[PDB]
């Protein structure tokens, strides 16, 4: 996250931390995610596309820190890793960048609620907040796009929703952003998601509910003039989610 | 064309591994193209068994039809306008001014190579050193001022050859300055040293190969501006496997097998800055490849150059300097490919001894190679 502040998992209790175990047994952080139901985490396909094997991943809930334990956190294996079959990448855009992870602990249980483990709500079909709405993004992503290190502590910042007409402008992104995507940025371009933030949540108030409006996907540089963060527009994917959460 | 480039590169890589094997734990930069280039010139000066050995080892004969023109075409392509003061190369053969040259040698040499053998008086030892080093200085535009090995020059010296190269390339995609941080580099003896390493996240041509003994190793391609040149970095995956596992199996054809197998993949690369400079006494490496006669006072045959003679190569030197840093002022017209994806990018960390290869992509010429044992 560019800008914003350090936060805690209690402030973002749906947040999922997703790690990959390499050949040779070392474990690195790959992507964020969001708990949508007891056994289901939603994230972005591009995070997993190059290593699509469910056994390589570890998912944490209730995790506040990148490389140490948080009291109350739960560790999960991935029982099913569903990537979108229509996922593809153009010169810049990632299309249908959405994934589902079914989670199971060693004792064979799904997520157990607590102060630090909560589900986020899904929007209803094609339901979005108006452009200009202040929304919140969260992750363990880089603080500056040129950094090597990731922050040890979770971060959050506020961004504003931006219309497709303005995002599809030639000096923005042109036709690289579709109606299945959503753009958000700082008015002063001081704040954005970044590398390490993909799969994580764009959270908006929608009809009195904390709502998963977008999933961090892609952008040109982090916090760059006329280059908003681009998010999978969740309200355009409910039939996909609903059918694939059956299995 | 590509042909004499294959043959020159094959030959020059073979010389490199002789130098690399004779200095297992030392930094080395070398030019396979340069050594091929000067020895192709020297071919014209040789006769009998001396000529035979050079031809056999190099894999081609400079007098064969199409060969000298092909090498000429190669040269113009390499030193073309793509070069933004990035590369300098020079070849030179120095012969005693006193020696009576075979009739028609110098015109023939000039026809095939468009340069002259230099005539110098070696009995003025101090002046001979000055002259030879001055040649190196001007033709590398000051980047290489002097050789050490010219100390061997002698009043009785009759024949010397020199080759010098400088390279500092401009990346197609620069490493951002902010990303340059101090990091641990693991030396081959098990010690570590703090060293400036550049970092960049983008789409790199990458492949993984296997040694004959079963060991994995990475190969990455870093293209220079406009894609005319590239640098290749190769290193074993596991820290315990020495770099020698790679250099023991090196050949020109292996390099292009790496390139032909590459796929563009989004990666974060951490790579040490480095500036290497090596002066290589060519005698041993060339002797190991069968060219023994040319260095033997009475056995040597340079009768194509001069026939009243005991005449032999007293001294044969290459000196190379390379700089690798962040910079990229781009003579590249295709805007830019980036990594837009916001996942944490998979990392390739080059923090143990690695080899590098600089190649000219249109011809496949291996211009430079080396081993960085300590940045």
From Swiss-Prot, chain B:
One of its GO terms (biological process) is negative regulation of smooth muscle cell-matrix adhesion. The gene is SERPINE1. It comes from Homo sapiens. SUPFAM superfamilies: Serpins. Inactivated by proteolytic attack of the urokinase-type (u-PA) and the tissue-type (TPA), cleaving the 369-Arg-|-Met-370 bond. Its main location: secreted. The keyword Signal applies. Belongs to the serpin family. It is linked to Plasminogen activator inhibitor-1 deficiency: A hematologic disorder characterized by increased bleeding after trauma, injury, or surgery. Affected females have menorrhagia. The bleeding defect is due to increased fibrinolysis of fibrin blood clots due to deficiency of plasminogen activator inhibitor-1, which inhibits tissue and urinary activators of plasminogen. Forms a heterodimer with TMPRSS7. Interacts with VTN. Binds LRP1B; binding is followed by internalization and degradation. Interacts with PPP1CB. In complex with PLAU/uPA, interacts with PLAUR/uPAR. Interacts with SORL1 and LRP1, either alone or in complex with PLAU; these interactions are abolished in the presence of LRPAP1/RAP. The ternary complex composed of PLAUR-PLAU-PAI1 also interacts with SORL1. Interacts with PLAT/tPA. Also interacts with SORL1, when complexed to PLAT/tPA. Serine protease inhibitor. Inhibits TMPRSS7. Is a primary inhibitor of tissue-type plasminogen activator (PLAT) and urokinase-type plasminogen activator (PLAU). As PLAT inhibitor, it is required for fibrinolysis down-regulation and is responsible for the controlled degradation of blood clots. As PLAU inhibitor, it is involved in the regulation of cell adhesion and spreading. Acts as a regulator of cell migration, independently of its role as protease inhibitor. It is required for stimulation of keratinocyte migration during cutaneous injury repair. This is Plasminogen activator inhibitor 1. It is found in: Secreted. Glycans are attached at residues 205, 261, 325. The keyword S-adenosyl-L-methionine does not apply. Expressed in endothelial cells. Found in plasma, platelets, and hepatoma and fibrosarcoma cells. Keywords: Glycoprotein, Protease inhibitor, Secreted, Serine protease inhibitor, Signal. GO terms for cellular component: collagen-containing extracellular matrix; extracellular exosome; extracellular region; extracellular space; peptidase inhibitor complex; plasma membrane; platelet alpha granule lumen; serine protease inhibitor complex. Induction: Up-regulated by coagulation factor Xa (F10) in atrial tissues. Up-regulated in atrial tissues by rapid pacing resembling atrial fibrillation. One of its GO terms (molecular function) is serine-type endopeptidase inhibitor activity.
